């Protein structure tokens, strides 16, 4: 009925905000570019999604052999695990803020709690989606209010000139850069769209002029990604206007935002706590939906590469568990350190953006053969190659 959808994923949340607590308005440009890129990529897969009656996974299978198949399957599994780790940490932090339970108990609750999603499914969709949409929209209103006196030409002229010296030299910059990119693309979204397009009442083969569906779907996808771009830009400039030009250059993870909202002077006293807990709720809900979307993606991947299948609850459970193991390892090793956990989170995102090319290459290749093809694949070519140079340099400086 009414509009309801969740666009903020803790990955992009932390990455964008961090990018505004440390370096300022510099990263802004990168965001745009990444967003634009994803648009194009969506387009591509959707074309592949609608013709050739296959899924990107099946595609990969039809250009490989058994072993390298195992390899790319490992890679896709690792991408999914990365996203799930991001999510579970998001949920754990949300719980620790709202209630007070320590992190380990929250992590365990999250991992073996998927029964909530069968319960609430038996409960009713429209209401829950409406209410979460309301709360997210309101949280975003709050952030907008919170942004204050600012100098536009700064943001602008830093968006534009793209100080390459800057964007490449600070190897702290490449880090959050790759973070933003790999959190704006999210390969699991690629596989999932490739599959989901396969069902829109197009006359599967008996309409050579089904491309009307292509145009409609691409329009939808572009609208979606555009609004995601606006949200990311907002979060970044928020981190900027709330932590920049200061002493000790506090990192700017989640906790710091949660406090800065509370102790915020001009917001009175109680309103601090009000917005605080609202933010907490938002974090939690975003985590959960980001989980639920990717289960189908994992299923599709395994069905494609190994040509095997499992019921969903087993899939979700085992993935979540193998995801939560690194969380607990890091917690016990580093005895609990918000700084250390948020650093793990960002490293997860950047690892996602490292894995991307192994799933980007075959997409381009396959769209170079069949009946429908892009005229200027050259954009994707330059994209992947510049990409490879960046990732290998960031690897090298280690």
């Amino acid at each position, epitope marked *: 009925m009414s509009v309801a959808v969740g666009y903020m994923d803790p990955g992009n949340w932390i990455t964008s905000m961090q990018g505004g607590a440390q370096y300022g308005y510099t990263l802004l440009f990168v965001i745009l570019i990444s967003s634009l890129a994803a648009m194009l990529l969506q387009s591509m897969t959707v074309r592949l999604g609608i013709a050739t009656g296959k899924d990107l996974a099946q595609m990969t299978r039809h250009f490989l052999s058994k072993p390298v198949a195992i390899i790319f399957w490992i890679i896709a599994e690792l991408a999914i695990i990365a996203t799930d780790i991001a999510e579970v940490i998001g949920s754990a932090i949300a719980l*620790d*803020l709202i209630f*007070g339970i320590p992190l380990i108990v929250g992590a365990l609750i999250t991992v073996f709690d998927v029964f909530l999603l069968l319960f609430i499914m038996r409960f009713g969709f429209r209401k829950i989606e409406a209410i979460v949409g309301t709360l997210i929209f309101t949280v975003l209103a709050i952030f907008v209010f919170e942004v204050f006196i600012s100098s536009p030409q700064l943001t602008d002229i830093l968006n534009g000139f793209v100080p390459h010296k800057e964007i490449v030299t600070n190897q702290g910059i490449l880090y959050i850069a790759l973070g933003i990119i790999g959190a704006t693309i999210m390969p699991h979204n690629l596989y999932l769209h490739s599959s989901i397009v396969q069902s829109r009442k197009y006359d599967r083969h008996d309409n050579q002029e089904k491309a009307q569906a292509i145009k409609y779907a691409t329009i939808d996808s572009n609208l979606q990604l555009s609004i995601a771009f606006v949200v990311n830009c907002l979060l970044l400039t928020l981190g900027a206007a*709330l*932590f920049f030009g*200061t*002493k*000790t250059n*506090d990192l700017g993870g989640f*906790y*710091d935002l949660y*406090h*800065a909202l*509370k*102790t*915020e*002077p001009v917001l009175g*006293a109680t309103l*601090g706590g009000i917005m605080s807990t609202l933010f907490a709720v938002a974090l939690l809900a975003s985590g959960q939906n980001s989980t639920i979307t990717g289960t189908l993606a994992g299923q599709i991947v395994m069905e494609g590469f190994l040509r095997l299948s499992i019921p969903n609850w087993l899939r979700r459970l085992i993935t979540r568990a193998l995801a939560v193991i690194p969380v607990i390892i890091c917690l016990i090793i580093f*005895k*609990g*350190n*918000s*700084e250390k956990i948020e650093q793990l989170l960002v490293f997860s995102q950047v690892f996602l953006s490292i894995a991307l090319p192994f799933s980007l290459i075959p997409l381009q290749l396959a769209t170079s053969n069949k009946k429908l093809m892009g005229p200027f694949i050259n954009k994707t070519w330059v994209n992947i190659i510049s990409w490879t140079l960046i990732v290998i340099l960031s690897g090298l400086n280690v």
Partner: nanobody
Framework: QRQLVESGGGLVQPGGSLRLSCAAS????????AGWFRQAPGKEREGVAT???????NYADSVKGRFTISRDRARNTVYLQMNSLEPEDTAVYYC???????????????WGKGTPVTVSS
């Protein structure tokens, strides 16, 4: 120097354990650097531990093995868990801090009032 409130001291047999908790009075943004001092009744204010901005947990040279400082970045509260206590650790345990009220105001010191801790049969 007020607006900090330690709490948790109490009688304890030799070899017991307990967790003192420096705190804040109202809605404090962050605790830069803590420190727990001791002022046993016939000596000078010694000093027992020191966390830093991120983490350093530097200790004294007579306590490593029993005292585990920590922080709680969620509800700003330094902790101090003493384990396997001894009859030579009786004293009042002050707390130091480096409170910073809001995200842009400079730092500012603060001392506590401290709490007693007795160890005996």
């Amino acid at each position: 120097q007020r607006q900090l409130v330690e709490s948790g001291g109490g009688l304890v047999q030799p070899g017991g354990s307990l967790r003192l908790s420096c705190a804040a009075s109202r809605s404090i943004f962050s605790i830069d650097t803590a420190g727990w001092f001791r002022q046993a009744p016939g000596k000078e204010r010694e000093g027992v531990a020191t966390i830093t901005r991120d983490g350093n947990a530097n200790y004294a040279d007579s306590v490593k093995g029993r005292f585990t400082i920590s922080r709680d970045r969620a509800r700003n509260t330094v902790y101090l868990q003493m384990n396997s206590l001894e009859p030579e650790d009786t004293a009042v345990y002050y707390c130091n801090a480096a409170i910073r009220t809001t995200v842009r105001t400079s730092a500012q010191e603060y001392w506590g009032k401290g709490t007693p801790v007795t160890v005996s049969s």
